[PDB]
Design a protein around this ligand. Structure first.
Ligand SMILES: CCCCCCCC/C=C\CCCCCCCC(=O)O
Length: 268
């Protein structure tokens, strides 16, 4: 009776969490100097960083449609519904490909465009896990996640602007972007790591008003010291109880550059 959850490799949730909650991941790939690697299957994050530091060209790719078709038909084998939630259609063709696959299987699959990435997607997955445990219908789940998204704010501080430009995801010093209905918009330029954090503090204070923070996540492109600077400021400003912190997946850092951070705040 419980729906089965599928996602892609861009949520930045821990492997322990994904495995513990039976979340099936369809991974994206990277092409580095003419050779491709499935993220976290054929290449580790340490290995990826070594390629980047060697000035190598990197591109990313959505999963092949056949990977979705195979997964959906197998997971649906006993008649269970599948809910397949993906990073923003404004950032990747993954969602569209999942939808196409859903029209080519006998299984019953509902595909959701999260309009987000990293913990913005991850927190939707975590809420989805809870709704499935509670027995909520798929149609109601879709509506509830739409409401939840209005309470998520995502910022990214770009590590290497030239990488972001090469990757093509811009829809509209340290550049700072946000997602606007799933599309990446650069909204501010900060002069330093420290000043970027002051900007983010003020923007988060504006976003939350007198609301509590339910979850706060920071994903980072191999720069924990920058994350720690943010935690120190945010601990004083907002008295955060716990952060979700992870090294971001190579598919994301391929676009942001090394030294980037992604801040995600879910308000109550
Ligand atoms: C450092 C962690 C940052 C987390 C927030 C990222 C916000 C969006 C900004 C840039 C990342 C873009 C990733 C695009 C992946 C495309 C995959 C594909 O090839 O289809």
């Amino acid at each position: 009776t419980k729906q089965i959850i599928v996602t892609d490799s861009t949520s930045d949730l821990s492997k322990e969490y994904l495995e513990a909650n039976n979340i099936h991941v369809i991974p994206l790939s990277l092409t580095i100097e003419g050779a491709s690697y499935v993220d976290q299957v054929d290449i580790t994050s340490e290995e990826f960083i070594n390629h980047i530091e060697n000035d190598e060209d990197v591109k990313t790719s959505q999963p092949a449609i056949g990977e979705f078709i195979s997964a959906y038909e197998e997971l649906g084998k006993d008649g269970s519904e599948i809910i397949s939630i993906h990073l923003s259609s404004g950032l990747s063709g993954t969602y569209n490909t999942a939808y196409q696959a859903s029209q080519m299987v006998d299984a019953n699959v509902t595909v959701i465009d999260s309009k987000s990435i990293s913990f913005g997607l991850g927190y939707q997955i975590q809420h989805l896990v809870e709704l499935v445990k509670e027995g909520v219908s798929t149609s109601e789940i879709v509506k509830k996640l739409n409401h939840l998204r209005e309470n998520i704010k995502l910022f990214v501080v770009i590590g290497q602007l030239n990488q972001l430009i090469k990757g093509g995801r811009i829809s509209k010093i340290k550049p700072i972007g946000t997602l606007d209905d799933g599309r990446l918009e650069l909204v501010h330029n900060a002069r330093t790591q420290n000043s970027s954090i002051q900007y983010l503090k003020k923007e988060i204070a504006e976003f939350i008003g007198d609301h509590e923070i339910k979850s706060i996540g920071v994903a980072h492109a191999n720069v924990i010291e920058y994350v720690d600077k943010l935690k120190k400021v945010f601990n004083e400003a907002f008295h955060v109880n716990n952060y979700d912190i992870n090294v971001t997946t190579p598919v994301i850092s391929a676009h942001t550059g090394q030294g980037a951070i992604g801040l995600v705040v879910l308000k109550k």
